[PDB]
């Protein structure tokens, strides 16, 4: 029954098995890289929080529009996603969460607007409809 | 099984059911190596509908109650056609697939889903 | 009918002029749709050219369906 | 004497150490900074920053917009985009980092499709042809 | 195909052509998924030269005399060696690939490209 | 020559002293190159250690090529 | 290797040794991919004791006495079981790995550790 075909198929599967092991090897290293890159952004935010807090507490005359809670009529979402698949159920779970949150906001009779980052989110919420305000694609690993 | 004997509607329902089952049989290989989340939304919907269809063909026979214990059921043709038309139309996408197992017509499915 | 492995050694000489002139588009559309059928379920992750090729190949494949006992002139 | 100067951007820290003096262009105008200064904060014009070491060597850092904060012992400069080079033409050296990172991001997508999505469909392509002839004695 | 019997330039040209073709055949899935834009600057020249080589293997058959024009070519081997050495080296890299189709020696492809 | 599965049960006792001494580096280089040959296609995020092993393995592999009728003493 | 044949203690000691070795094999790939520091402390102990076990399964042979000056050792039962029961309980966690290499019963292991 053409056993050489089955032998070739087994060889090809065993080759792809080697192919994926190396991709795992690389993904671990980039996870380490991004993990240590997350740390370098901390001092800037810390210093800015300190300065803003001191400035706002020392001069309590006025309240800025970003620090006061006004009644809600419309909300907004900034959705970040990946550019290519083959990464678990990351995007699917994130989109399920945001869809459930939007449905919960719908009963409050407040509509939503979006701003999408990453190709997967762009496609998903272009098919979903909604009120898009902007789109961005090809962010990369170390965005500027 | 041709339109000139069983009618147009029955033939269309049977062919649609077979098409859904065939596409699920073809997708069964990708979802094993890769995940269920690599597929598009239509393919996931087809997978769920095909599992529900596979469950819905189960039935308790009048003579098999010795082995299991549940009484047998005798489903007329009209009930089968009506149930499968609805299941293909997507009306029952909100019913968990465990409610289509070992039941008679489509009403038992809804009753069992409500009991759950 | 499986177009991938069905052949006819007589070929074009056994066709009327119009069908002989027209069958080239069908043959090449099926060839292109068959070369990359392995990615058919991954149309979301592809460029635009191959996605258009899939879009046309699916349509031409759907065109070849036909009922029974009703032949076409 | 000396005072702790930190120049940190939104991404990482650019410059650090102990310096004796600082020159920057605030919103009002140029500013001279020496240790023991009264607390102060401005917004920086897109111009270079000059810091004078105790030995006499003077480093220059290019900053395009940001917030300057000064305290009697520490100067913290928060810059939107800071590069350690000298001249005003540092786009000609920022382009090197831009090109390198863009090339890496390009080659990545060059490897994601080639390795993962290609092979992992080839493996799953033709399995069914083998499983059906499993029991045949011919 | 042995350097002792066919000389050294023949063998080297054949080996280079085979290498180019069998690398372009491997680039197929990547070209189909990503497109031609994201490939390196190298392996784009390979795609263009491989397409040109595939076109240049075309030949008009003398016995046909219909749809071709009785075009007996019977190109000497030296002409083909010169042509493929030039094509691999890159002297003809600027010519549209449609010129290399259905002609004999390089003089004919040059004439066809200049005419268009 | 497929170095992975080829074997000689006589082993070291069938070699001259110099080649017997020097063969270990070749054997281990081929082993290490064959273990991680999958990485040769990426060549982007290879750390310093494995890149050196790849560089040595490819060079040794290129070394073993040889023509006909030209034996080496 | 059944409790009815070799007694009770021997069976459990052997099964625990096999379990530790299996867990260490499951941990080595994680060590290779994700760094040594990612593991918890229990896995640190598992790795250390598994390496000690793998060393302790080595011993010199009487036939190697001609080739190598080390005399061969014939360690009986009720002496390997003691060593492995002590090793699996952490009782020897302060001994370096190298002391468990090419040696007989646990007493010579202690002596060689003393000489280290």
UniProtKB/Swiss-Prot annotation, chain A:
It comes from the Bacteria. It is found in: Cell inner membrane. Belongs to the ATPase gamma chain family. Produces ATP from ADP in the presence of a proton gradient across the membrane. The gamma chain is believed to be important in regulating ATPase activity and the flow of protons through the CF(0) complex. F-type ATPases have 2 components, CF(1) - the catalytic core - and CF(0) - the membrane proton channel. CF(1) has five subunits: alpha(3), beta(3), gamma(1), delta(1), epsilon(1). CF(0) has three main subunits: a, b and c. This is ATP synthase gamma chain. The lineage of its organism: Bacteria, Pseudomonadati, Pseudomonadota, Gammaproteobacteria, Moraxellales. The gene is atpG. The chain holds residues 2 to 145 of 289 of the full protein.
Swiss-Prot record, chains B, E, G:
One of its GO terms (molecular function) is proton-transporting ATP synthase activity, rotational mechanism. GO terms for cellular component: plasma membrane; proton-transporting ATP synthase complex. Keywords: ATP synthesis, ATP-binding, Cell inner membrane, Cell membrane, CF(1), Hydrogen ion transport, Ion transport, Membrane, Nucleotide-binding, Translocase, Transport. The keyword Cell membrane applies. It is found in: Cell inner membrane. Its main location: membrane. The keyword Transport applies. Belongs to the ATPase alpha/beta chains family. Produces ATP from ADP in the presence of a proton gradient across the membrane. The catalytic sites are hosted primarily by the beta subunits. F-type ATPases have 2 components, CF(1) - the catalytic core - and CF(0) - the membrane proton channel. CF(1) has five subunits: alpha(3), beta(3), gamma(1), delta(1), epsilon(1). CF(0) has three main subunits: a(1), b(2) and c(9-12). The alpha and beta chains form an alternating ring which encloses part of the gamma chain. CF(1) is attached to CF(0) by a central stalk formed by the gamma and epsilon chains, while a peripheral stalk is formed by the delta and b chains. This is ATP synthase subunit beta.
Curated annotation (Swiss-Prot), chains C, F:
Produces ATP from ADP in the presence of a proton gradient across the membrane. The alpha chain is a regulatory subunit. Belongs to the ATPase alpha/beta chains family. This is ATP synthase subunit alpha. It is found in: Cell inner membrane. The record marks 6 as: Required for activity. The gene is atpA. The lineage of its organism: Bacteria, Pseudomonadati, Pseudomonadota, Gammaproteobacteria, Moraxellales. The chain holds residues 369 to 441 of 514 of the full protein. It comes from Acinetobacter baumannii (strain ATCC 17978 / DSM 105126 / CIP 53.77 / LMG 1025 / NCDC KC755 / 5377). F-type ATPases have 2 components, CF(1) - the catalytic core - and CF(0) - the membrane proton channel. CF(1) has five subunits: alpha(3), beta(3), gamma(1), delta(1), epsilon(1). CF(0) has three main subunits: a(1), b(2) and c(9-12). The alpha and beta chains form an alternating ring which encloses part of the gamma chain. CF(1) is attached to CF(0) by a central stalk formed by the gamma and epsilon chains, while a peripheral stalk is formed by the delta and b chains.
Curated annotation (Swiss-Prot), chain D:
It comes from the Bacteria. One of its GO terms (molecular function) is ATP binding. GO terms for cellular component: plasma membrane; proton-transporting ATP synthase complex. InterPro entries: ATP_F1_dsu/esu_C_sf, ATP_synth_F1_dsu/esu, ATP_synth_F1_dsu/esu_N, ATPsynth_dsu/esu_N. Coiled coil: none annotated. Gene3D superfamilies: ATP synthase delta/epsilon subunit, C-terminal domain, F0F1 ATP synthase delta/epsilon subunit, N-terminal. Its main location: membrane. It is found in: Cell inner membrane. Keywords: ATP synthesis, Cell inner membrane, Cell membrane, CF(1), Hydrogen ion transport, Ion transport, Membrane, Transport. It holds the Pfam family ATP-synt_DE_N. It is a peripheral membrane protein. Belongs to the ATPase epsilon chain family. Produces ATP from ADP in the presence of a proton gradient across the membrane. F-type ATPases have 2 components, CF(1) - the catalytic core - and CF(0) - the membrane proton channel. CF(1) has five subunits: alpha(3), beta(3), gamma(1), delta(1), epsilon(1). CF(0) has three main subunits: a, b and c. PANTHER family: ATP SYNTHASE DELTA/EPSILON CHAIN (PTHR13822), ATP SYNTHASE EPSILON CHAIN, CHLOROPLASTIC (PTHR13822:SF10). This is ATP synthase epsilon chain.
